[PDB]
Amino acid sequence: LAYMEGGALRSMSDKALGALRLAVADNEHLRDALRLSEDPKRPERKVQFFIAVYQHLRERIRQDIIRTDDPVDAIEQMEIELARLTEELTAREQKLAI
Amino acid sequence: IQSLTARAPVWLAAQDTLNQLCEQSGETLASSNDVTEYMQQLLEREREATVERDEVAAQKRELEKQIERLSQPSGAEDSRMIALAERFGGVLLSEIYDDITIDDAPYFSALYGPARHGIVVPDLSLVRPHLETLEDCPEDLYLIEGDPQSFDDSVFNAEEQTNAVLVKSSDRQWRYSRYPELPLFGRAARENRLEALNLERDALAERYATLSFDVQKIQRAHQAFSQFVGKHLSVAFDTDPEAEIRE
Amino acid sequence: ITIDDAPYFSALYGPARHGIVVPDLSLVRPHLETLEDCPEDLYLIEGDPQSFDDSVFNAEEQTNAVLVKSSDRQWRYSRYPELPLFGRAARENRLEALNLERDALAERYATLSFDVQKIQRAHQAFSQFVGKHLSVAFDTDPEAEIRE
């Protein structure tokens, strides 16, 4: 993005914030951090929000079965878990039927 | 300078995408040809993992089929044994011997032979009409005559031997039943054994899930590489503009 | 034995289909306790291997099935199987059909491999082009500019 004027950057930021609004509807702490982050005179808050995201995304890892501190690398582990749980669901359905 | 600046953003985005894609892999890419050999290695790993996954899946399916075969009403040839059992006022012999001990279970199973799973019908004349109708049934259906509640032991030309039983099934004909393990009769701990089968299949399913996830990961990596090359090759491995622009 | 009655013979014999024609029965009883690898429900019959008399059954023929008084209070109902243990005649045509299917699969694999080879070759040609002529690819003719 180093070679793009500021107006387009503002537009992408606006669209991303619009998406985040829907995305973080459920959470309250992340929602509050986002609501703080839009003050143009406190830029660091935005950065903090990102940290607050990753930080949060780490605590809810459920590290009991996951290890990757980086949430980006935990998508594979969640996919593994969904596959395993689909197998377990099939087994449970058969057991309930019998 | 303006030409290089115009070229810049495309090159920079390309470099970032390529770096992410390669770092995701253990290897670092340096050429279009190198990307092609990486694709070939990806295909090799995929065509391997799929074979192991299918083999594990076949083993798994066999395990669940075996587990089910022991399920209901009392683990037996319940595919048609059910209808064959309630359609006539009889009771499964295996169920009749459901509570026999694990020790007497092998002896009685060997004694009864292929007739272990038979159905007790004191008349044998209820099945006489329906016999012609039966075209969907186990290739060898077994029936015994007596009181289902208190059936008297089938009279046999039995002859017990060490961990086995000889029997004379018909004139000049002997069947020698070696004491089986984990028999048909005594279907109380056989439920425990099908539980053991479930335990066994747990690891099979775990391994199958790991193989399936590996297959999915390789597929997604290949698709990402394809999309990359679709958007990316035009500027891949080209010189850095930023240094030129600064100079 | 004939193909026609082979399913009948198999249905009649049941699990006793697989049996050894030992006219003595005396080598088994001492060795009976000595048999451990043998099939759990081993079947043995007394008869002459040179001329094996028809085995003893109280057989009644139902439509594509049989009922035999196997023993007292034991009437056994069986159906006609396919590819019976008796009358195999080496069933060589089944082997041939399986070989036909395998050979068709191999031919299909060969054709697909040839197609993959051609696709690989085309890919390598494209890579070669983009490695050596991509820079000037699709660009205009400089002769007009030179003349201008």
Angle at which helix B189-232 crosses helix B2-24, to 10 degrees, equals 160
- CA quadruple B210, B211, B212, B216: dihedral sign: positive
Instruction: Name the residue among A3, A91, A98 with its Cβ closest to that of B8.
Output: A3
The SS3 assignment for C60 reads strand
Instruction: Name the residue among A83, A94, A98 with its Cβ closest to that of B213.
Output: A83
Which chain A residues contact residue B71 at CB under 8 A?
A: 98
Instruction: Name the residue among A3, A80, A91 with its Cβ closest to that of B213.
Output: A80
Kindly calculate the radius of gyration of chain C based on its CA atoms and give it in whole angstroms.
35
Whole-number Å distance between alpha carbons of C90 and B134:
30
Q: Is B212 on the interface with A (CB under 8 A)?
A: yes
Instruction: Please name the amino acid found at residue A4.
Output: M
Under an 8 A CB cutoff, do B115 and C33 touch? no
Q: Is B216 on the interface with A (CB under 8 A)?
A: yes
C residues 65..94 contacting B (CB < 8 A): 65, 67, 70-79, 81
Q: Is B39 on the interface with C (CB under 8 A)?
A: no
Q: Are B186 and B100 in contact (CB under 8 A)?
A: yes
Report the gap between the CA of B213 and the closest CA in chain A (Å).
6
Under an 8 A CB cutoff, do B178 and C40 touch? yes
Neighbours of B69 (CB within 10 A): 15
Whole-number Å distance between alpha carbons of A67 and A9:
35
The residue length of chain A stands at 98
The residue length of chain B stands at 247
Instruction: Please name the amino acid found at residue C31.
Output: H
Whole-number Å distance between alpha carbons of C133 and A46:
46
Under an 8 A CB cutoff, do A3 and B9 touch? yes
Residues 6+ apart with CB under 8 A from B117: B76, B77, B81, B92, B93, B94, B142, B184
> Are chains A and C touching, using the cut-off of 8 Å on CB pairs and a minimum of 3 such pairs?
no
Instruction: Name the residue among C19, C32, C44 with its Cβ closest to that of B161.
Output: C32
Q: Is B178 on the interface with C (CB under 8 A)?
A: yes
Q: Which of C52, C73, C117 should be substituted to probe chain B, the one whose Cβ sees the most B Cβ atoms within 10 Å?
A: C73
Whole-number Å distance between alpha carbons of C74 and B157:
13
In chain C, where does DSSP find H-type helix? 6-13, 28-32, 92-132, 142-147
Q: Is B161 on the interface with C (CB under 8 A)?
A: yes
Give pairs for B215-218: CB < 8 Å, separation 24+: B215/B46, B215/B49, B215/B50, B215/B53, B216/A79, B217/A76, B218/B42, B218/B45, B218/B46, B218/B49
Q: What kind of experiment solved this structure?
A: cryo-EM
Q: Is C105 on the interface with B (CB under 8 A)?
A: no
Minimal-distance CA residue of chain B relative to C62 = B132
Report the gap between the CA of B118 and the closest CA in chain C (Å).
9
Query: How far is residue C115 from each of residues B219, C11, C110, C122, measured CA to CA in Å?
Result: 21, 50, 9, 11
Whole-number Å distance between alpha carbons of C108 and C102:
10
HEC readout, chain B = CHHHHHHHHHHHHHHHHHHHHHHHCCCCCCCHHHHHHHHHHHHHHHHHHHHHHHHHHHHHHHHHHHHHHCCCCCCCCHHHHHHHHHCCCCEEHHHHCCCCCCCHHHHHHHHHHHHCCCEECCCCCCHHHHCCCCCCCCCEEEEECCCCCCCCCCCCCEEEECCEEEEEEECCEEEEEECCCCCCCCCCHHHHHHHHHHHHHHHHHHHHHHHHHHHHHHHHHHHHHHHHHHHHHHHCCCCCHHHHHHC
Q: What is the DSSP letter of C86?
A: T
Q: Buried (b) or exposed (e) across B138-165, using 16+ Cβ within 10 A?
A: bebbbbbbbebeebeebebebeeeeebb
Minimal-distance CA residue of chain B relative to C69 = B170
Instruction: Name the residue among C36, C55, C81 with its Cβ closest to that of B173.
Output: C55
Whole-number Å distance between alpha carbons of C15 and B116:
13
The verdict on whether residue C17 carries a ligand-binding annotation is no
Under an 8 A CB cutoff, do B209 and A4 touch? no
Under an 8 A CB cutoff, do C77 and B154 touch? no
Report the gap between the CA of A92 and the closest CA in chain B (Å).
12
